[PDB]
Structure formats: C-alpha cells, structure tokens
C-alpha cells in the first residue's frame, strides 16, 4: 500500500498563493523525491520541480522561478507546493508522484496522485440560467427529433444535466464548458424518436450545488 | 535541457491491430525513459520504465525497446481500453521532460454530422441576450469545419466551440456550436443558418431558420 494523497481543488484569486499538498503513506518517506507536475487544460504533462525530505535538497524547471516554492514536513508524511502570483494560465490539475533517492529502475515515477485541480478566477459564484432549445419549426426530419437545453453564465463548474430526471440518457451530448467572459456556458442535447416529441414534454433537470441551484426546464414546441 | 520530440500527435488505429509511438531524445538519455499512460479521467499509469521493462500486472501486449535516440512503446495488439493518452518521460538528467503527447483513437465507418439549428428561447430574448445554438452530432472523423451566416453573410464574432470526446459506445464525435448576440443585433437580421464541412460530402450540411418566420 504505497499511497500519495493529494489535497482537493483549489479556487483562487488572481495573485493569491495556494499551498497544495501530497500525502505519503507505505515507504520510507525520506527515501524518495516528491516530484510535482502540471497538467493545463487539453495540454501535456511539464515537470515542475522535486524536493527530497526532510533535506534542504529541492530542484525545479527554470521556467516556475519566483513561482513554486517546495517544502516537505517528515513528521506527518506530507510535501507541499506552493504557488504564488496565480494568474489565468495556473489554472490546471497538478499531480505529485515519487522518485527513489537510489538505485533502483523500478522506483522511479513509479505511484501517481490523482491531481489536485486549481482554478484561478476572479469571479463570484453565480447560478446559470436554463434555457430551453425548440426547433424553431423545421422538416423535423422524418425520424428522430433533436432537442436541447442552454446553461449558461454560472460559476463555478461544475453544473448536471440530466433528461427526464436520467430515465432519458440513451440519445445524450452533454458538452463541455466553455468561459464565455468570466463565466461557463454549457449546453446539453438529447435526440429522440419523433413519435414521442410534442406528443409528450421532455424536460431537462440542471443542477448547480456550488448556488443551491436546481431546476426543469420543459421543452416546449415553438408553434411560432 | 533534454528535449522529447514524441510522434506521431495523434494517431487513429482498429481493435487488434499493433502501433508504436516514438520519443526521439535530443541528447543521449541512457536507458532512462518511461512511459505513461493517462486515462480520461485524468489517471496516470507508468507502463514501462527504464525503456524496456514491464509494470507489475502491466498486460504483455505493451512493449518499450530503442534504436539510436529513438525510444518507442509498441502495442501489438489494440484492445478497445488502449484508446487514450501516452507520454513518455526522460529522467536521466534533471530538469525532466516529457514528450508532448500522443492521443490514440478509434477507427470506425465514416459518419456525416447531424446538425440542428435552435433559435434563442423568448426568457432569453427578455434577459437581453440572444444565443443561437447549432448541434452537430455524431460524426466520424473529428475534423469539422463550422460556419455561421446571417442574412446571407459570414460572421465570426461571437462564436464558441465545444467539443465531446470520442464516444465510448459508437466512436463518433459530436459538437455544439453557439453564436451569442445582444437582443437589438440578432432582431437587425433575419435569416441565420449554421453550415457544416467534413469528408463524407463533398458540399455542406446547411441549418437555417428565420426569425420573421413566426
């Protein structure tokens, strides 16, 4: 049972520090490099720094001077990053994993965190507004009927979407979310069986925890 | 510091055909390269370590070996869980690097996009605003071409992309397309229409409504 436990997600203000963490438990903690590494949305993996505990031994990529400061704690099994100055482009999941102080081919890069996600955002929390997507009175095709719902200007992510309360799931997109100025919009779509559409509502539920938001939005045909 | 140049980017195969990937190191690196596997959950994996080991409970069907300052990972048989991201790494000398990725998807049949176009709902309308929302749905392959017109005319301000990964059950993708404008500018005009370009036809997939149309 090598372990490393990494802090949660992090929100943060443009210019702020924030000190994440990564949680050792199954081996000697001084042994090994704590290696740190950035991930940015849709990018590769890039190496940003290590430190060795409990020594003054760190190290770090070039371009994170004045920006990462390493540290580590052997009492409770813990090494910290700390990032400062946040802008915009910190925005990203950051993963920790461990480095042998030896030699050994097989303990290098070895055990992986699962990441801890920082958000560098000015804005306020802010629920979404729900809108409904009806044709706007097409050929409907002739077999299936597209549907959809807008959620937009809410922050932070993430927001559900769900069709019919999830009874409806088979004919589902829900797409990413996109920043629209300081804030997300998503949309969702769901294809159904003409047959079934305006016959009867199809609705989609949108929940929004970060806002205490929830609600249904029933898509009604247009009609004009 | 030692650079990774890892090719190819991207690269589309079938269950149970073989493929490798390429790390071709700048400076010499040893046998000191690993390689990584991330699922789209965000997972990262080490595969192979020091070149040519296996991880323990690793499958067999992985493989890392160099020729030169090519380092590769051969899979020789695709299975459907395969299908995603590889990165290797060189930690012989400090600062490490990785190579900048290769993403592995899915051959499947040729599919032309489902488009549809929505207008704005009237609680926008009342809100100030006015988003018009075109789906394009289950296509294969991932290059698409978007193109918006109003009244006849090519408009690229305003418009937003968004992108679903390969599909885990039939392989395609599918895209929202979203043009945003005040309440006063989408009522300056009339007829609005997303166009979609991709391989399956040789001319594109036209959505259009009118606002004065109802």
């Known amino acids: 049972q090598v372990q490393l436990q990494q802090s949660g997600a992090e929100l943060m203000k443009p210019g702020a520090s924030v000190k994440l963490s990564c949680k050792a438990a199954?081996?000697?903690?001084?042994?090994?490099?704590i290696e740190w590494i950035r991930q940015r949305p849709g990018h590769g993996l890039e190496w940003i720094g290590e430190?060795?505990?409990?020594?003054?031994?760190?190290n770090c990529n070039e371009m994170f001077k004045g920006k990462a400061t390493f540290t580590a704690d052997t009492s409770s099994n813990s090494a910290y990053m700390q990032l400062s100055s946040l802008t915009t482009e910190d925005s990203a999941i950051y993963y920790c994993?461990?480095?042998?102080?030896?030699?050994?081919?097989?303990?290098?890069?070895?055990?992986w965190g699962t990441g801890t996600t920082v958000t560098v955002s000015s804005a306020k929390t802010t629920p979404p507004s729900v809108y409904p997507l009806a044709p706007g009175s097409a050929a409907q095709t002739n077999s299936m009927v597209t549907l959809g719902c807008l959620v937009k200007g809410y922050f932070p992510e993430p927001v559900t979407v769900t069709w019919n309360s999830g009874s409806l799931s088979s004919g589902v997109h829900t797409f990413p979310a996109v920043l629209q100025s300081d804030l997300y919009t998503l949309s969702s779509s769901v294809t159904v069986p003409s047959s079934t559409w305006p016959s009867e509502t199809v609705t989609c539920n949108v929940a929004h925890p970060a806002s205490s938001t929830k609600v249904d939005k029933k898509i009604v045909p247009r009609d004009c | 510091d030692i650079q990774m140049t890892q090719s190819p980017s991207s690269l589309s195969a079938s269950l149970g055909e073989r493929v490798s990937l390429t790390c071709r190191a700048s400076?010499?690196?040893?046998?000191?390269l690993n390689w990584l596997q991330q699922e789209p959950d965000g997972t990262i994996k080490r595969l192979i370590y020091a070149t040519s080991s296996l991880d323990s409970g690793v499958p067999k069907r992985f493989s890392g070996s160099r020729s030169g300052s090519d380092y590769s990972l051969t899979i020789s048989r695709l299975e459907s869980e395969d299908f995603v991201d590889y990165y290797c790494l060189q930690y012989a000398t400090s600062p490490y690097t990785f190579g900048g990725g290769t993403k592995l998807e899915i051959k499947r049949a040729d599919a032309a996009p489902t488009v549809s176009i929505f207008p704005p709902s009237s609680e926008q309308l009342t809100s100030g605003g006015a988003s018009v929302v075109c789906f394009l749905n289950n296509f294969y392959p991932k290059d698409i071409n978007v193109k918006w017109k109003i009244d006849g005319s090519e408009r690229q301000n305003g418009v937003l992309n968004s992108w679903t990964d390969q599909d885990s059950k039939d392989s395609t993708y599918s895209m929202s397309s979203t043009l945003t404008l005040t309440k006063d500018e989408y009522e300056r005009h009339n007829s609005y229409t997303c166009e979609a370009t991709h391989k399956t036809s040789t001319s594109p997939i036209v959505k259009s409504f009118n606002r004065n149309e109802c």
């Open positions: 430190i060795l505990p409990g020594s003054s031994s760190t």
């Open positions: 400076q010499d690196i040893g046998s000191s």
């Open positions: 994993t461990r480095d042998f102080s030896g030699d050994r081919s097989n303990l290098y890069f070895d055990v």
């Open positions: 199954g081996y000697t903690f001084t042994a090994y490099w």
